[PDB]
Amino acid sequence: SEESQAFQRQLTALIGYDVTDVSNVHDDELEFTRRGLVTPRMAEVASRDPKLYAMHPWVTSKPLPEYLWKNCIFIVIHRSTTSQTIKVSPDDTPGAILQSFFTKMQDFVLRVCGRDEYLVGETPIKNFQWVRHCLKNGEEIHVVLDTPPDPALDEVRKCDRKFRVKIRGIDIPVLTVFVEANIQHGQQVLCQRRTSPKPFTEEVLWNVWLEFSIKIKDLPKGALLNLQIYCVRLLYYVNLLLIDHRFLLRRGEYVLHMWQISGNADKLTSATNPDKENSMSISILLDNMPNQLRKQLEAIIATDPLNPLTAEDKELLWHFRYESLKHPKAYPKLFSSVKWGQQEIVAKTYQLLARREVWDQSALDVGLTMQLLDCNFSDENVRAIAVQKLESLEDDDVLHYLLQLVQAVKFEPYHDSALARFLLKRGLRNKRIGHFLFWFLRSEIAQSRHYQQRFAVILEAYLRGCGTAMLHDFTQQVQVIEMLQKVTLDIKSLSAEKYDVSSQVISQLKQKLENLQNSQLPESFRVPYDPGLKAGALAIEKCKVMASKKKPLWLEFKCADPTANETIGIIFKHGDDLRQDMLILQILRIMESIWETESLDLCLLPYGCISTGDKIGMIEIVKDATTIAKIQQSTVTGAFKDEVLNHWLKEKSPTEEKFQAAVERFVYSCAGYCVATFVLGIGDRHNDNIMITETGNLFHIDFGHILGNRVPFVLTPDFLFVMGTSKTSPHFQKFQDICVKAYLALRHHTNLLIILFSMMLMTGMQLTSKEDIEYIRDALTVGKNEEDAKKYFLDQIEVCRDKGWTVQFNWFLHLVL
């Protein structure tokens, strides 16, 4: 069909990669995966509620916090002229509120004023994320009687002998070298052979038959042939799945283009190097119970995920594997104790999985579930039982772990996978999920040559089922992002390695932007980091180019929603890998959850940020916020003064009653960022990397900088001037009381943070894993008593008092030399 070709052209333009193209494939897995996802796609499309899918009700079914609980409450309503306030009970259906509205006087829906968010469905108003946002921020719930959107807008378009591999030779377009062949399964190497080293040249031939110890029957599905080149240090690498998607053993001649290194999930990839004119290639041929022991494992099951098992541990686990089966928290360690290079053993582990009665009936432990989805596990079925526990996550939580579940796809041996199919369903089922699925996938596709192939096939599958509404919506989003990012770069080319920003460049930018505002960027576009916001025409008289080191584009747009006057602010930066920033910010959001469960709000501000390409993305502008550094520089440039901080809160808050609030907001925002940054290990920043709002909310910025390059956290005397310490004030007591509660509340979800962290460093960081990840263990005091850990953190606080301006004074010296 002529139109099928133009649709595929629209698909490719949205994704960023051509899925139909078969230049960089030596098999058809991707094309087989493309078709595989056709069934699950259409399945969830057929299963989704048209009315609800079109209105995407963002709701939660978790307990309301003890603080937020502090019956019947007011909400304003609207019909152009009418705006009557109504007293509504917490447990009241949105439909019943319409019937309660008829009393004060049938298909008109209660929509949110300002953004495109809806209040529908059979759920209490208390269980809405927008309603809980209004209460917490202390605002007025303003609604408007809009008529529900036509679901028609979301319509869809129709042997036994040993294994041996022959290494023929290696070629490169442009002083000794050998080839290493490793049979891997879950990063663990089963067998290893190496060729005799020959001198480095353009064509190094061997024609060597490399026979391993492994039997063919013993090869586990998901086994990767890791071919590497040395000198001794690793230079090029490339992988080939010994068993394919049709369960077939790989036979035949394979000329594989290898990846070059720069010394990481990027090592596992089955994909081959796209660039053929430059990359090095390789040609190969394929033609084929007592109390002491119980006490013993009770310890092993009880230790952290980063605690390595000895051969003695693993033997113990496997031998009493049925007692190990009775403990959910033992599954990752038990499934590490498996001899995967052994058909006999594996089958037994499968017979073991059939008795999942205890695992199935266990309460969802996300930290445990994902621990089974990292790189330690190549087995499809083990990983399956993980994606199975995930199923009972309500849309609210999926959105908490989407980014990391999406990155987790890199650890999957095959393209088509249970996890992938899960992520496809949950995104087609919920528009918010779908939105972020899109941008997370499109993030990698446009800067990861290692995985863009697999990811494109996933995203393409999604777009074919999301509905023409979002299809068009995504398009006008991508249209604008590219437009702006282009402006960002041309303005970066004018910016030199100078400290100050040009005068002639500010009118240049304006001019450049005035070209776009004329005819190009659509009258409206839905902001990527916040799908609730619909932005429109630029406030060009407020768009500027910041005096930063990277000097990014500061951009402001007007609200396109007429029910809303405050501008939508977006920062466009190039030079910094915003995938790093993306992950940190997301773990921050997860931390707010951990605190909410324990009934705490620590006033964190995880600002919106999405990477849209190669070290280029966008960041949300927090209104009325400025840097701690700039505030020190306003009164004083180096000799910091404690008084300044509290003077700035007085200055920016008129009402004394509003000033007390500002300080209250700060004691929470400070403590929260003190705790978080310390655990994530990025606690030692410069004043310029911490900001505060006029309302008195402190928040950290720029997170790729720190981990991607002493004091526990940034607790300087000026912050202590606000609590009332030169000494322990009634607010500094409030401060530590909070820190402790928060620190402990985080400690209770240790295994979670620990595997998220290790995952982050694997999927989005170029770092020595063994050493780097083991900081988060120490930082949380793994094993130590509650009272013993309590002081440990209070001990960190004292360190900040001991080294008051010591640290910042040094950063000010460093960020100058």
- C-beta contacts of 139-143 below 8 A and 24+ residues apart: 140/74, 140/75, 140/76, 141/74, 141/75, 141/76, 142/75, 142/76, 142/78, 142/112, 142/113, 142/114, 143/75, 143/76, 143/77, 143/78, 143/110, 143/111, 143/112, 143/113, 143/119
Residue type at position 427: G
- Exactly one of 444, 581, 596, 718 binds ligand SD5 (CB under 6 A); that residue is 581
What is the closest distance, in whole angstroms, from the C-beta atom of residue 699 to ligand SD5 in the complex? 7
Nearer to ligand SD5, 460 or 576 (CB): 576
The yes or no reply on residue 704 touching ligand SD5 (CB under 6 A) is yes
Of 253, 257, 286, nearest to 269 by C-alpha is 257
The yes or no reply on residue 707 touching ligand SD5 (CB under 6 A) is no
Q: How many residues bind ligand SD5 (CB under 6 A)?
A: 19
* Distance set, CA 218 to CA 185, 307, 636 (Å): 12, 29, 72
What is the closest distance, in whole angstroms, from the C-beta atom of residue 181 to ligand SD5 in the complex? 41
Nearer to ligand SD5, 309 or 505 (CB): 505
Nearer to ligand SD5, 433 or 609 (CB): 609
- Exactly one of 420, 571, 680, 745 binds ligand SD5 (CB under 6 A); that residue is 571
* Distance set, CA 557 to CA 178, 620, 676 (Å): 58, 12, 32
Nearer to ligand SD5, 283 or 627 (CB): 627
- Exactly one of 435, 442, 573, 665 binds ligand SD5 (CB under 6 A); that residue is 573
- Exactly one of 116, 244, 444, 576 binds ligand SD5 (CB under 6 A); that residue is 576
Residue numbers belonging to the annotated binding site for ATP: 569-578, 604-612, 699-707
Nearer to ligand SD5, 14 or 619 (CB): 619
- Exactly one of 538, 701, 723, 807 binds ligand SD5 (CB under 6 A); that residue is 701
What is the closest distance, in whole angstroms, from the C-beta atom of residue 546 to ligand SD5 in the complex? 6
* Distance set, CA 148 to CA 41, 116, 118, 145 (Å): 25, 11, 9, 9
Other Cβ atoms closer than 10 A to 100? 15
Q: Which range binds ligand SD5 by CB under 6 A, 98-106, 116-124, 227-235, 700-708? A: 700-708
- Exactly one of 43, 625, 707, 782 binds ligand SD5 (CB under 6 A); that residue is 625
Q: Which range binds ligand SD5 by CB under 6 A, 183-191, 379-387, 699-707, 769-777? A: 699-707
Nearer to ligand SD5, 621 or 782 (CB): 621
Residue type at position 305: P
* Distance set, CA 666 to CA 68, 472, 691 (Å): 18, 42, 11
- Exactly one of 27, 29, 395, 702 binds ligand SD5 (CB under 6 A); that residue is 702
Whose tokens are 């494992």? That residue is: 297
- Exactly one of 548, 597, 599, 810 binds ligand SD5 (CB under 6 A); that residue is 548
> How would DSSP label each residue in 164-202?
EEEEEEEE----EEEEEEEEEETTEEEEEEEPPPEE--S
Q: Which range binds ligand SD5 by CB under 6 A, 235-243, 619-627, 644-652, 669-677? A: 619-627
Angle at the Cα of 749 from the Cα atoms of 379 and 126, rounded to 5 degrees: 105
Nearer to ligand SD5, 500 or 802 (CB): 500
CA distance 513 to 499: 24
CA distance 383 to 393: 17
Nearer to ligand SD5, 502 or 548 (CB): 548
In this chain, which residue has its C-beta nearest to ligand SD5?
622
Nearer to ligand SD5, 113 or 628 (CB): 628
Residues numbered 144-163 forming contacts with ligand SD5, rule: CB under 6 A: none
Q: Where are the beta strands (DSSP E) in 645-733?
A: 690-693, 698-700
For residue 207, the SS3 value is: strand
Nearer to ligand SD5, 29 or 581 (CB): 581
> How would DSSP label each residue in 501-520?
PPSHHHHHHHHHHHHHHHTT
What is the closest distance, in whole angstroms, from the C-beta atom of residue 616 to ligand SD5 in the complex? 11
- Exactly one of 619, 682, 715, 759 binds ligand SD5 (CB under 6 A); that residue is 619
Nearer to ligand SD5, 704 or 764 (CB): 704
What is the closest distance, in whole angstroms, from the C-beta atom of residue 739 to ligand SD5 in the complex? 24
Other Cβ atoms closer than 10 A to 596? 19
- Surface-to-core class of residue 151, CB atoms within 10 Å of its CB (0-12 exposed, 13-18 middle, 19+ buried): middle
Nearer to ligand SD5, 369 or 669 (CB): 669
Residues numbered 669-688 forming contacts with ligand SD5, rule: CB under 6 A: 688
Whose tokens are 């009325």? That residue is: 624
* Length of the chain (residues): 817
Structure tokens at 817: 């030399």
What is the closest distance, in whole angstroms, from the C-beta atom of residue 510 to ligand SD5 in the complex? 19
What is the closest distance, in whole angstroms, from the C-beta atom of residue 252 to ligand SD5 in the complex? 47
- Exactly one of 35, 355, 550, 791 binds ligand SD5 (CB under 6 A); that residue is 550
What is the closest distance, in whole angstroms, from the C-beta atom of residue 476 to ligand SD5 in the complex? 24
Question: CA quadruple 539, 540, 546, 552: dihedral positive or negative?
Answer: positive
Residue numbers belonging to the annotated binding site: 569-578, 604-612, 699-707
Of 16, 124, 144, 27, nearest to 77 by C-alpha is 144
List 177's β-bridge partners, or say none.
198
What is the closest distance, in whole angstroms, from the C-beta atom of residue 690 to ligand SD5 in the complex? 10
Nearer to ligand SD5, 374 or 702 (CB): 702
Binding mask 363-402 for ligand SD5 (x = CB under 6 A): ----------------------------------------
The yes or no reply on residue 556 touching ligand SD5 (CB under 6 A) is no
- Exactly one of 236, 411, 595, 607 binds ligand SD5 (CB under 6 A); that residue is 607
Quickly list H helices, 354-430.
357-360, 366-371, 380-390, 395-407, 418-429
Contact predicate 607/623, CB 8 Å? no
Nearer to ligand SD5, 318 or 703 (CB): 703
Other Cβ atoms closer than 10 A to 748? 12
Contact predicate 686/815, CB 8 Å? yes
Binding mask 491-530 for ligand SD5 (x = CB under 6 A): ----------------------------------------
- Exactly one of 296, 597, 599, 627 binds ligand SD5 (CB under 6 A); that residue is 627
For residue 276, the SS3 value is: coil
Q: Which range binds ligand SD5 by CB under 6 A, 69-77, 422-430, 571-579, 733-741? A: 571-579
CA distance 75 to 109: 15
- Surface-to-core class of residue 101, CB atoms within 10 Å of its CB (0-12 exposed, 13-18 middle, 19+ buried): middle
Indicate the DSSP class of residue 343: H
Contact predicate 550/573, CB 8 Å? yes
Binding mask 633-672 for ligand SD5 (x = CB under 6 A): ----------------------------------------
Structure tokens at 138: 């202390």
What is the closest distance, in whole angstroms, from the C-beta atom of residue 412 to ligand SD5 in the complex? 29
The yes or no reply on residue 568 touching ligand SD5 (CB under 6 A) is no
- Exactly one of 16, 434, 552, 717 binds ligand SD5 (CB under 6 A); that residue is 552
Nearer to ligand SD5, 378 or 677 (CB): 677
What is the closest distance, in whole angstroms, from the C-beta atom of residue 379 to ligand SD5 in the complex? 38
Binding site for ligand SD5 (CB under 6 A): 546, 548, 550, 552, 571, 573, 576, 581, 607, 619, 621-622, 625, 627, 688, 691, 701-702, 704
